[PDB]
Amino acid sequence: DQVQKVDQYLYHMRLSDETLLEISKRFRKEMEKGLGATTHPTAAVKMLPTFVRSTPDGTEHGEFLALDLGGTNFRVLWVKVTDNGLQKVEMENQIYAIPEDISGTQLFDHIAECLANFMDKLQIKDKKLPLGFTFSFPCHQTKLDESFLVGRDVVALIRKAIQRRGDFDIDIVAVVNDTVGTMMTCGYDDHNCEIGLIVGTGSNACYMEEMRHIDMVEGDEGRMCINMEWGAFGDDGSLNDIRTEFDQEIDMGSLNPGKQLFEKMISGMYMGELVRLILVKMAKEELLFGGKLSPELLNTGRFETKDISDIEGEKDGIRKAREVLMRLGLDPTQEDCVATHRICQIVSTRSASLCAATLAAVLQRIKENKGEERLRSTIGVDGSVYKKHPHFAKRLHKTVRRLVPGCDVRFLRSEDGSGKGAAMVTAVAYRLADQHRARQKTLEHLQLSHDQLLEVKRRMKVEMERGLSKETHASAPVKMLPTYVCATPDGTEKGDFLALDLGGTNFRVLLVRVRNGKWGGVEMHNKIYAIPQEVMHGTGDELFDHIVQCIADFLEYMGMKGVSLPLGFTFSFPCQQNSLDESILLKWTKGFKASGCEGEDVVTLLKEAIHRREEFDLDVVAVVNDTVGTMMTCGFEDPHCEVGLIVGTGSNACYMEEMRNVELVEGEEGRMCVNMEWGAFGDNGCLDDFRTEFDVAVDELSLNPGKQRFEKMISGMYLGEIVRNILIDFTKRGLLFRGRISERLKTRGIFETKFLSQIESDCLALLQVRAILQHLGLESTCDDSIIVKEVCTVVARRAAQLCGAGMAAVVDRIRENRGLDALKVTVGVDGTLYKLHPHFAKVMHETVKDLAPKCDVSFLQSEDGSGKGAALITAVACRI
Numbered sequence: 001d002q003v004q005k006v007d008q009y010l011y012h013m014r015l016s017d018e019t020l021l022e023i024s025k026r027f028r029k030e031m032e033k034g035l036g037a038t039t040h041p042t043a044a045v046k047m048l049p050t051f052v053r054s055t056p057d058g059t060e061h062g063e064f065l066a067l068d069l070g071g072t073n074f075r076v077l078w079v080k081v082t083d084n085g086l087q088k089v090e091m092e093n094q095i096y097a098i099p100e101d102i103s104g105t106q107l108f109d110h111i112a113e114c115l116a117n118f119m120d121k122l123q124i125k126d127k128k129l130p131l132g133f134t135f136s137f138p139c140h141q142t143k144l145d146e147s148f149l150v151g152r153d154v155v156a157l158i159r160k161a162i163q164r165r166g167d168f169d170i171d172i173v174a175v176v177n178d179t180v181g182t183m184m185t186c187g188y189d190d191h192n193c194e195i196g197l198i199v200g201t202g203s204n205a206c207y208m209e210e211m212r213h214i215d216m217v218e219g220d221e222g223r224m225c226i227n228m229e230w231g232a233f234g235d236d237g238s239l240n241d242i243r244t245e246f247d248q249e250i251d252m253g254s255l256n257p258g259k260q261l262f263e264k265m266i267s268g269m270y271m272g273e274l275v276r277l278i279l280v281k282m283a284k285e286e287l288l289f290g291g292k293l294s295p296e297l298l299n300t301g302r303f304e305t306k307d308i309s310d311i312e313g314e315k316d317g318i319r320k321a322r323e324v325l326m327r328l329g330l331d332p333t334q335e336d337c338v339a340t341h342r343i344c345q346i347v348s349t350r351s352a353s354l355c356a357a358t359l360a361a362v363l364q365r366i367k368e369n370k371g372e373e374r375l376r377s378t379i380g381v382d383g384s385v386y387k388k389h390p391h392f393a394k395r396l397h398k399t400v401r402r403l404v405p406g407c408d409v410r411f412l413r414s415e416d417g418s419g420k421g422a423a424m425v426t427a428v429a430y431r432l433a434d435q436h437r438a439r440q441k442t443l444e445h446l447q448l449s450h451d452q453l454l455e456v457k458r459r460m461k462v463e464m465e466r467g468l469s470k471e472t473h474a475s476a477p478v479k480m481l482p483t484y485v486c487a488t489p490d491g492t493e494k495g496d497f498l499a500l501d502l503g504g505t506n507f508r509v510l511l512v513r514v515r516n517g518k519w520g521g522v523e524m525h526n527k528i529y530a531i532p533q534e535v536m537h538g539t540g541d542e543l544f545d546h547i548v549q550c551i552a553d554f555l556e557y558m559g560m561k562g563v564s565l566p567l568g569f570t571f572s573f574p575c576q577q578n579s580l581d582e583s584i585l586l587k588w589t590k591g592f593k594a595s596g597c598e599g600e601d602v603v604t605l606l607k608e609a610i611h612r613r614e615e616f617d618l619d620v621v622a623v624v625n626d627t628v629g630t631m632m633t634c635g636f637e638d639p640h641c642e643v644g645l646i647v648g649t650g651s652n653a654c655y656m657e658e659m660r661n662v663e664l665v666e667g668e669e670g671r672m673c674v675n676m677e678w679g680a681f682g683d684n685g686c687l688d689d690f691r692t693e694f695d696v697a698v699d700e701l702s703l704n705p706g707k708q709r710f711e712k713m714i715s716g717m718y719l720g721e722i723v724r725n726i727l728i729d730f731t732k733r734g735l736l737f738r739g740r741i742s743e744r745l746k747t748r749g750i751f752e753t754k755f756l757s758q759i760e761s762d763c764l765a766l767l768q769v770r771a772i773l774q775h776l777g778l779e780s781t782c783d784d785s786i787i788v789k790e791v792c793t794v795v796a797r798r799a800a801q802l803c804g805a806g807m808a809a810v811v812d813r814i815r816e817n818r819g820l821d822a823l824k825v826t827v828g829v830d831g832t833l834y835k836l837h838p839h840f841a842k843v844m845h846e847t848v849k850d851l852a853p854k855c856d857v858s859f860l861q862s863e864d865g866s867g868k869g870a871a872l873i874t875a876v877a878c879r880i
């Protein structure tokens with residue numbers, strides 16, 4: 001019944017979950033104030049960047065030194081870290097004294113000397129090792145190696161002191177707060193640990209934070225640990241409705257009035273004192289001890305945090321309260337001991353609840369940063385309150401987990417403390433460096449020197465000459481097909497042309513209208529039709545009847561029903577083409593089972609189907625390959641365009657060639673367009689020394705192994721498969737995705753050209769790269785985004801440079817034909833990669849300018865077809 005009296009008396013010290021979530025939201029605002037640039041200088045929670053960029057992944061290894069300086073004593077540690085799988089650290093340490101005599105230079109001279117004794121005593125003085133520092137307060141820190149004590153940089157001092165000895169030398173330095181060392185130690189055993197926590201004589205906490213939220217450090221990429229210094233929460237008044245008169249009293253009787261106010265609520269230094277003030281006051285009000293007081297009860301610090309831990313710890317704590325009160329000089333009754341015991345619980349429970357509230361906000365922010373619904377997270381924990389107070393860890397654990405239902409949160413107590421932590425920072429720093437040059441060693445295989453592309457250019461040369469002559473054209477991989485397109489535009493052409501573009505299950509039927517003369521141009525009308533799955537699995541004669549009405553329908557839908565026209569034809573399928581108007585289907589592709597086609601002339605197939613529709617009677621002028629149509633299409637814009645190019649789900653190219661050089665066609669006078677089928681470049685082995693294991697792996701798993709090898713380096717779904725195979729390799733090697741391969745990352749096809757283009761065009765915080773990686777079902781961590789964006793940029797650059805080297809041959813092979821030097825030529829280009837990719841165009845233009853300096857090459861975009869150039873080759877065929 002004295003419990004309820006205390007409860008009602010101390011009511012403002014018993015915090016409802018409501019109050020705690022409100023306090024949690026308040027802390028969230030303070031975190032944003034300290035992180036933001038304009039609000040940081042007056043923010044009470046400083047949110048200091050630690051410059052620690054990553055937690056441990058468990059494979060850290062090496063030997064490391066550290067110093068922990070508290071004053072009047074300090075330790076020098078040697079930390080041996082092995083990657084054997086056990087994550088078992090090896091330590092030795094030694095304590096040295098700093099007498100009152102030990103001027104700055106004298107002090108660090110003494111420190112370097114001890115460190116020198118320690119290294120000699122320890123065998124290691126010929127070794128040059130990293131050195132961590134740990135401090136129990138903040139300094140002013142602009143980089144891992146720096147801090148100003150606030151009067152000078154302590155790293156410069158210890159380094160210049162080492163230089164004056166000449167004994168040993170020291171490697172990279174890190175200076176970290178003791179919360180940070182706690183997090184780092186725990187994160188070496190548990191790699192979900194993103195939060196250091198200390199509830200000690202003092203209290204503070206740190207966490208990993210995303211660089212896009214840290215204004216005070218340049219750059220938006222990745223993460224950095226933030227030392228919150230949350231002891232100062234409420235220094236500006238934010239907590240003053242939670243804080244009581246006892247809280248106020250402690251603050252005025254403190255060495256630092258008005259500072260560290262949240263600490264003064266929750267930590268062990270003031271915790272017992274805060275209980276004394278309640279006893280003094282209740283007694284002065286005659287609610288305890290019959291009003292009597294003792295000289296010791298009114299002396300500060302005489303009731304100790306240790307006494308709280310005792311009183312709640314023993315099964316009889318009323319007896320242990322009787323004894324503490326007696327030592328204070330009082331004569332307690334049973335009630336007085338009941339009330340004392342309970343006051344101890346209320347105070348210690350408030351400390352545990354206030355930690356929960358602010359831990360809740362940190363957990364919530366890490367959760368919104370990662371952006372999933374559920375969060376596995378571990379809190380590295382240290383300090384004398386949470387370790388040696390009997391019930392408080394339980395109370396903290398239970399309250400945190402209530403306040404964050406969305407989180408599975410482990411607690412792990414750090415034993416060995418802050419010595420290894422600073423050491424572990426330098427160990428993780430070495431690991432980041434090793435993994436960087438590791439994955440850069442793989443990427444170097446995909447970065448080609450200007451001398452290497454010239455060699456690739458050369459081999460495109462020989463393979464072109466080889467395909468044109470009649471001797472090797474059977475053996476040549478680049479087949480150099482004659483198109484029988486012998487002429488290019490004038491301003492002359494005028495009329496209406498139909499284009500039938502058929503490959504895959506949906507053809508388009510298009511009407512092309514040409515306005516001659518300067519200005520003028522072309523407009524399009526298409527319509528898309530589907531070939532039903534029956535029609536495609538049936539006979540070929542019912543296939544082209546279905547085709548022919550879709551022409552009849554659209555001609556009518558143009559309003560033109562009943563008019564005869566000339567017609568160009570895009571038939572995308574393996575073909576032997578013997579004449580402009582004649583082509584033989586070799587193999588069906590794309591899913592067409594239609595009988596009576598392979599081995600037949602596709603135009604007679606189409607023409608005999610036009611005879612049968614009783615009205616129809618249209619004229620079939622030409623059969624074309626889609627690159628040829630691309631070249632022709634911007635020939636109407638630019639008369640100087642001799643070359644087509646498509647970079648897309650596939651890649652191909654064509655130029656106008658001297659008929660002297662085409663030996664598969666009788667007669668040497670004039671020029672003829674050559675459809676290279678240059679995706680087949682490299683299928684004889686000529687690129688085999690540029691093909692990585694990743695190229696080889698894409699090749700073996702496609703529909704057409706050993707075939708179209710150059711197309712698979714420069715374009716298609718193949719780029720994202722190259723990317724994926726690299727990413728899998730990095731992950732097997734521990735270099736990405738923390739060494740664990742999703743079944744979803746083993747899914748072939750997931751990296752799609754549209755995604756390689758957005759990934760590469762994203763900057764700053766890479767939110768769009770992470771978004772895509774979430775979309776595809778992959779780990780999205782900031783660190784992972786950078787790497788993935790890098791792999792994409794490398795792969796897409798090689799594709800553009802390789803495309804440049806080969807397109808460089810073509811413009812010289814046009815030039816050596818004519819014996820010329822400086823040429824202005826223009827290339828019509830189509831295809832989705834080149835239009836939509838951010839850097840692909842520019843890189844290839846640069847590549848062509850670099851490896852063909854004598855040629856001056858413009859690239860004009862064409863598009864529209866492909867299938868539309870089919871009617872424009874007809875306009876120039878209806879020429880004669």
Ligand SMILES: Cc1oc(S(=O)(=O)NC[C@H]2O[C@H](O)[C@H](NC(=O)c3cccc(Br)c3)[C@@H](O)[C@@H]2O)cc1C(=O)O
Pocket residue numbers: 046136137138177178179198199200201202203204205229231232263268382383384385
């Ligand atoms: C293991 C252990 O560590 C300690 S501790 O008290 O030495 N370190 C905890 C935190 O204490 C303070 O809050 C520090 N801030 C300041 O002093 C500070 C000073 C000025 C301005 C500002 Br703003 C902050 C924090 O930086 C520090 O992390 C006790 C124990 C134990 O076992 O009892």
Ligand SMILES: Cc1oc(S(=O)(=O)NC[C@H]2O[C@H](O)[C@H](NC(=O)c3cccc(Br)c3)[C@@H](O)[C@@H]2O)cc1C(=O)O
Pocket residue numbers: 572573574575625626627646647648649650651652653677679707711830831832833866
């Ligand atoms: C506008 C655009 O066009 C395309 S595309 O894929 O239709 N054209 C590129 C090339 O594809 C392959 O390389 C073709 N060769 C063969 O398959 C081939 C031909 C003969 C034998 C063997 Br064995 C293979 C070439 O004829 C064709 O030029 C994609 C896009 C886009 O924007 O994504």
